[PDB]
Amino acid sequence: MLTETEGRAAVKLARKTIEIFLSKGKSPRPDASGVELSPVFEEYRGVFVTLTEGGLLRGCIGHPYPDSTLKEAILDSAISAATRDPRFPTVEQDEMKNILVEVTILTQPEKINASPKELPDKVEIGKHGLIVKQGYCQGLLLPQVAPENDMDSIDFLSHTCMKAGLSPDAWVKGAEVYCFEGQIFKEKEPDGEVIEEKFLEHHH
Amino acid sequence: MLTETEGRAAVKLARKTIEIFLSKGKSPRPDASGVELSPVFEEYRGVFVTLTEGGLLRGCIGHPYPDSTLKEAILDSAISAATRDPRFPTVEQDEMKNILVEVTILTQPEKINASPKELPDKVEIGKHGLIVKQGYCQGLLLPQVAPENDMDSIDFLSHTCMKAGLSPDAWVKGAEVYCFEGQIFKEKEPDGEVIEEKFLEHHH
Amino acid sequence: MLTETEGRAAVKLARKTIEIFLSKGKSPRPDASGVELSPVFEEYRGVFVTLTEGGLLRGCIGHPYPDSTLKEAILDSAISAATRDPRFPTVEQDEMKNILVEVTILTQPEKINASPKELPDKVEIGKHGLIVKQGYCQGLLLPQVAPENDMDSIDFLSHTCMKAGLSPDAWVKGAEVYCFEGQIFKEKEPDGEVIEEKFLEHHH
Amino acid sequence: MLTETEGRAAVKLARKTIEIFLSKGKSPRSGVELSPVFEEYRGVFVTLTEGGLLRGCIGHPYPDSTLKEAILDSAISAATRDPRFPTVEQDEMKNILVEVTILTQPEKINASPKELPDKVEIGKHGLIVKQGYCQGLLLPQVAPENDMDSIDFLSHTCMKAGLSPDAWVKGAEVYCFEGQIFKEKEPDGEVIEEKFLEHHH
Numbered sequence: 001m002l003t004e005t006e007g008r009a010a011v012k013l014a015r016k017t018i019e020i021f022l023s024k025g026k027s028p029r030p031d032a033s034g035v036e037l038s039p040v041f042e043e044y045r046g047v048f049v050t051l052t053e054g055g056l057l058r059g060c061i062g063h064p065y066p067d068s069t070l071k072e073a074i075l076d077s078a079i080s081a082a083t084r085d086p087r088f089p090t091v092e093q094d095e096m097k098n099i100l101v102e103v104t105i106l107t108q109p110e111k112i113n114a115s116p117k118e119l120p121d122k123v124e125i126g127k128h129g130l131i132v133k134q135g136y137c138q139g140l141l142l143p144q145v146a147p148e149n150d151m152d153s154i155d156f157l158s159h160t161c162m163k164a165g166l167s168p169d170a171w172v173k174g175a176e177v178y179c180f181e182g183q184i185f186k187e188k189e190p191d192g193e194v195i196e197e198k199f200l201e202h203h204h
Numbered sequence: 205m206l207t208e209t210e211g212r213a214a215v216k217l218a219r220k221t222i223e224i225f226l227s228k229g230k231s232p233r234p235d236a237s238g239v240e241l242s243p244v245f246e247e248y249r250g251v252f253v254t255l256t257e258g259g260l261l262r263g264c265i266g267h268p269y270p271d272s273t274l275k276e277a278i279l280d281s282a283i284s285a286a287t288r289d290p291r292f293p294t295v296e297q298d299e300m301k302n303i304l305v306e307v308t309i310l311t312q313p314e315k316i317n318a319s320p321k322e323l324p325d326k327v328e329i330g331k332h333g334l335i336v337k338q339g340y341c342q343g344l345l346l347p348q349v350a351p352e353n354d355m356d357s358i359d360f361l362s363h364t365c366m367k368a369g370l371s372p373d374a375w376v377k378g379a380e381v382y383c384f385e386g387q388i389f390k391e392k393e394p395d396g397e398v399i400e401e402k403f404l405e406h407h408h
Numbered sequence: 409m410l411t412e413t414e415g416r417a418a419v420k421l422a423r424k425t426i427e428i429f430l431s432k433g434k435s436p437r438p439d440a441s442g443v444e445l446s447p448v449f450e451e452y453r454g455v456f457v458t459l460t461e462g463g464l465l466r467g468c469i470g471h472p473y474p475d476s477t478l479k480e481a482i483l484d485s486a487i488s489a490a491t492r493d494p495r496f497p498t499v500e501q502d503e504m505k506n507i508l509v510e511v512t513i514l515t516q517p518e519k520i521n522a523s524p525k526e527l528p529d530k531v532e533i534g535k536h537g538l539i540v541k542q543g544y545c546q547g548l549l550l551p552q553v554a555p556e557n558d559m560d561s562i563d564f565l566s567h568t569c570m571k572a573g574l575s576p577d578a579w580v581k582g583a584e585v586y587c588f589e590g591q592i593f594k595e596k597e598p599d600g601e602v603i604e605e606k607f608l609e610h611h612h
Numbered sequence: 613m614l615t616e617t618e619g620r621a622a623v624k625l626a627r628k629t630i631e632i633f634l635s636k637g638k639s640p641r642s643g644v645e646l647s648p649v650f651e652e653y654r655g656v657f658v659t660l661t662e663g664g665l666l667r668g669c670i671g672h673p674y675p676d677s678t679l680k681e682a683i684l685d686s687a688i689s690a691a692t693r694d695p696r697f698p699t700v701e702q703d704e705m706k707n708i709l710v711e712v713t714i715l716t717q718p719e720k721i722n723a724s725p726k727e728l729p730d731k732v733e734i735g736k737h738g739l740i741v742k743q744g745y746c747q748g749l750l751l752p753q754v755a756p757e758n759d760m761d762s763i764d765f766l767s768h769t770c771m772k773a774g775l776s777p778d779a780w781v782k783g784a785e786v787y788c789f790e791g792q793i794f795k796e797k798e799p800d801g802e803v804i805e806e807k808f809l810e811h812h813h
Contacts, residue, residue, distance in 0.1 A: 048407060055392055055399055060407045064354070087408065117525045126291075134774075136744060141353050149345055149367065158577045159363055163353065165743075165779065167771045168366065168576045169566045188259055195259055203252060203264045204291060321726045338573070339544055362778040369542070369578065371570045372777045373767045456812060463797055463804060468812040472759075495813060549758050557750050557772065558673075567768055571758065576771065596664050603664055607696060611657060611669045 002040060002105055007185035008194040009035050010103040013071075014049045014078035015096070015191060021079045022093040030071050041071040043108055049077040050102035050186075051091065058099055059085040064140055065131075066108060074103065102186040104200065109178040116172050120153035123179060126204045130156060131178040132164040132171065139164025143182055147204035206309055210244050211389035212398045214307045217241070217275070218253050218282040219300070219395060225283045226297045234275045245275040247312055250384075253281040254306035255295065262303055263289040268344055269335075270313055270384075278307060306390035308404070313382035320376045324357035327383065330408050334364040335382040336375060343368025347386055351408035410448060410513055415593035416602045417443050421479070422457050422486040423509045423599060429487045430501045438479055449479040451516055454588075457485040458510035459499065466507055467493040472548055473539075474516055482511065510594035512608065517586040524580045528561035534612045535589055538568040542583040547572025551590050555612035614714055618649050619794035620803045625650075625680070626658045626687040627710045627800065633688050634702045641684065650680040655715035655789070658686040660700065662708045668694040673749055674740070675717060683712065711795040713809070718787035725781045729762035735813050736790055739769040743784040748773025752791060753810035 002010065013035045020028040031037075047070060048062025061080035063073040078101075082091040091099065109131050114122045123130065129143035141163055146156045158168040161175060171177055184197040206214065217239045224232040235241065251274060252266025265284035267277050282305075286295040295303070313335050316326045327334065333347035345367055350360045362372040365379060375381055388401040410418065420443045428436040439445070455478060456470025469488035471481045486509075490499045499507065517539050522530045531538065537551040549571055554564045566576040569583060579585055592605040614622065625644045633639050656679060657671025670689035672682050687710075691700040700708065718740050721731045732739065738752040748769055755765045767777040770784060780786055793806040 050406060055390065056401055057403045057406070062407055087403065135746070137746075145349060145353060149349060151367075154577065154580050155367075158575070158580075159366065162363065162366065162372065162776045162778075163355070163359070165776050165782075167566070167774055167776060168372070169562060169580070170774065172562055172566075172577070172580065173774075186259065197260055199261050199291065202254060202261070203266055203289075341543070341545070358778060358781055362776070362781075366575045366577075369575055369581075371573055371575060371767070373570075373763060373781070374573065376763055376767075376778070376781065377573075458811065463795065464806055465808045465811070470812060495808070553754060553758060557754060559772070563772070567771065570768065570771065570777065571760075571764070576777070594664060605665055607666050610659065610666070611671055612696065 001107060001181070001183060002185075004196065006038055006040050007103070007105070007183065007196055009037055009041075010070075010074060010105060011101050011185050011187055011194050013037065013074050014103050015101045015187075017075050017078045018082045018091070019093070019096055022082070022091065022096065027075055027079055030075060037071060042069050044068065045070050045073075045108050046106035046180075047073045047077055048104040049074065049081040050104065051081050052100045052102065053095065053098055059088050059091065061085055062104070064106075064142065066106070070105065097190055100187045100190060102184060104182055104184045107181045109180040112177045112179050116174060119157055119171055119177060123153040123156055125151065125153060125156065126201060127181055128179045129182065130160040131180070132157075132160045132166065132175055133178065134164065134166055134170055134175040137164045137166050139166070142200070144201035147201040205311060205385070205387060206244055206389070208398075208400065210242050211307075211309070211387070211400055213239055213241055213245070214274070214278060214309060215305050215389050215391055215398050217278050218307050219305045221279050221282045222286045222295070222305075223300055226286065226295065226300065231279065231283060234279050241275060246273050248272065249274050249277065249312050250310035251277040251281055252308040253278060253285040254308065255285050256304045256306065257299065257302055263292050263295060265289055266308065268310065268346065270310070274309065301394055303394060304391045305394075306388060308386055308388045310386045311384045313384040316381045316383055320378060323361060323375060323381060327357040327360055329355065329357060329360065330405060331385055332383040333386065334360060335384065336361075336364045336368045336370065337380040337382065338368065338370055338374060341368050341370060343370070346404070348405035351405040409515065409589065409591060410593075412604065414446055414448050415511075415513070415591070415604055417445055417449075418455075418478075418482060418511045418513060419509050419593050419595060419602050421445065422482050422511050423504070423595070425483045425486040426490045426499070426509075427501075427504055430490065430499065430504065435483055435487060438483060445479060450477050452476060453478050453481070453516050454514040455481045455485060456512040457482065457489040458512070459489050459507050460510065461503065461507045466499065467496050469493055470512065472514075472550065474514070478513065505598055508595045508598060510592060512590055512592045514590045515588045517588040520585045520587050524582065527565060527579055527585060531561040531564060531585075531587060533559070533561060533564065534609060536587040537590065538564060539586040539588070540565075540568045540572045540574065540579065540583050541586065542572070542574055542578055545572050545574050547574070550608070552609035555609045613716060613790075613792060614649055614794075616805065618647050619714070619792070619805060621646055621650075622679070622683060622712045622714060623710050623794050623796060623803050625683050626712050627705070627796075629684045629687045630691045630700075631702070631705055634691065634700070634705065639684060639688065641680070646680060650683075651678050652717055653677065654679050654682070654717050656682040656686055657713040658683065658690040659711035659713070660690050660708050661711065662704065667708055668697050668700065670694055671713065673715070673751065674747070675715070679714065706799055708799060709796045711793060713791055713793050715791045716789050718789040721786045721788055725783060728766060728780060728786060732762040732765055732788065734760065734762060734765065735810060737788040738791065739765060740787040740789065741766075741769045741773045741775065741780060741784055742787065743773065743775055743779060746773050746775055748775070751809070756810040756813040
């Protein structure tokens with residue numbers, strides 16, 4: 001989990017990277033964006049960068065898996081959010097002064113160390129996201145999936161298993177299960193104050 | 205799909221219903237809200253009422269299934285989003301002047317009339333939410349589920365079947381499949397202009 | 409479990425029913441077959457009637473579910489095995505003196521009263537056959553299925569759930585689980601000595 | 613598919629492997645004319661019956677070994693490694709009937725998922741679902757005996773491989789195979805062939 005300070009740096013970094021990229025058509029050097037980044041940005045974790053304009057979605061791309069360091073993923077996601085979202089036209093430079101940035105940061109996935117019959121009780125609906133990995137098969141469902149679609153812990157484990165391409169009961173037979181959380185930091189005004197949204201799901 | 209006019213009427217109904225219930229303690233009569241409602245409100249469709257305060261989630265409750273008329277669904281969902289969301293404290297009367305009201309309206313679910321071999325090509329990821337029905341058993345998944353969790357048509361059909369408590373291949377064996385879409389109307393400001401968000405999914 | 413006598417009566421009933429049907433062309437009166445029948449024959453349980461000739465399958469029909477009393481189930485399965493097996497022509501009257509009769513009797517299915525956490529431990533592979541029921545959905549898998557296809561308790565419960573048209577994890581969620589056993593009684597010689605085969609499965 | 617001649621050689625190989633092992637407590641290979649079919653990789657089961665009752669049966673469903681090797685191993689295990697029965701004594705073989713179930717080499721079904729259910733024949737085909745290093749198989753008698761159509765069979769085999777039931781719909785490889793049974797009508801005597809692997813359909 002990121003502190004308020006780290007959360008603020010996250011959005012500032014996303015905003016900076018985009019503005020830099022919209023100007024010189026090139027991404028900034030990871031450690032030379034003009035934002036102080038604590039060592040947490042070196043951790044491998046997923047993230048999503050959301051852009052809103054006039055209260056409407058303007059673009060959003062992200063890394064669900066911790067395939068990249070937080071730093072790299074923010075850079076890539078932010079530039080992708082403003083220029084690679086096929087649902088929207090590329091954002092122009094002067095548009096950013098009217099665009100609001102949102103950064104959803106996922107925690108480093110940690111293996112739930114329990115026995116098959118204990119797993120349901122260790123999976124918290126509304127807080128946890130899951131990754132099921134067995135052999136070379138891997139699958140994941142974001143935290144909002146379970147609460148927004150009325151799934152209990154047993155349901156969540158089973159759907160994530162099938163998401164991985166495995167049998168729904170794979171978790172019952174010992175499939176490796178990892179859990180992770182998320183947090184959202186967002187601009188209250190362009191380049192302004194940053195607020196934190198604890199809930200990733202709309203409804204539960 | 206609701207027109208701008210109807211969408212505006214929907215959000216207004218949500219606000220009024222909440223303000224009235226918060227005022228006294230008796231849910232006003234749906235048609236007796238003071239808000240004009242076209243015949244679209246007599247249609248059976250699912251809905252969600254979302255409240256935000258200062259850019260942060262303040263409450264949200266809904267009924268995804270089309271079991272009540274739009275009018276009644278909004279009514280119930282609105283008061284519940286404000287007083288029955290176990291995630292937040294009850295909304296106080298004086299808080300509504302600082303709250304933004306959002307209303308997500310789902311379309312009347314329509315049966316996909318295609319053989320099992322053709323069903324996947326009928327399901328559009330990003331637009332369609334699904335309902336699988338078999339006898340009295342029924343299950344549904346919101347439109348945003350597939351796009352946000354990298355599921356294709358086949359995955360969505362299989363997952364919705366399991367959500368219904370049925371085998372993942374139930375759709376392959378002729379189980380009924382219904383699809384639906386949604387739209388969001390939200391206040392740019394309390395009791396102010398209402399805009400339309402056509403995207404139910406954050407990312408795809 | 410049927411006794412040696414009851415089992416002997418089972419085969420004799422099956423054999424006599426056929427010899428009588430083949431001759432006069434009608435089914436004997438259920439209680440005027442010529443074989444003593446204990447009260448076990450009034451219990452609702454499944455059974456199969458097998459006919460072999462010269463060491464080869466000649467016919468086989470049965471009732472997997474306890475839809476009928478043992479008596480009724482045997483008369484019907486016996487006549488069908490001799491005259492209604494689409495894999496073979498109808499048996500001739502002179503053929504019965506060259507045919508061996510086999511009868512597989514299943515026990516009345518009994519609900520396993522255990523929590524999902526206990527279910528796998530209560531299901532004995534190689535002995536138990538399963539029936540899963542949850543509402544109007546019902547499915548069963550014979551005792552030999554699990555041991556012949558290398559399935560453990562967990563696998564067997566999941567496969568029976570899907571057989572019932574339900575999600576594989578239905579048992580983890582509280583779906584009703586019923587177990588049953590079986591035994592085979594067969595003629596060592598035409599209308600001769602009846603021996604009991606305790607294993608319904610070829611391998612395990 | 614094995615010829616009748618080969619079918620007879622398979623049961624004799626099974627019977628002799630057991631008598632010899634039961635004699636000097638170990639194994640060779642023989643004295644039985646074996647055609648090249650015994651060098652093919654295919655599953656097999658060896659069954660022993662005595663007095664019309666099962667006396668032992670062990671087998672390898674998957675074609676992990678050549679038929680020859682699978683037969684020797686299965687036969688010896690059927691007589692000395694089946695925990696359901698006590699070990700068979702030397703004197704017992706003269707009163708035991710030998711049965712050998714030989715499965716064909718699994719052949720890939722080359723069709724689109726839409727066509728697979730049409731290619732699977734209930735009653736004849738057994739299935740192996742393969743996706744990477746994950747494999748699963750269900751014997752031919754499974755579908756007809758438990759009232760499963762093609763779709764059911766494909767889905768259950770996918771789960772048997774530890775995969776999602778809809779894996780076959782998503783392109784997982786499917787292989788089909790058949791089997792045949794050759795059995796002794798008399799100890800060390802005549803060998804007939806049972807055409808039906810399923811009890812009931």
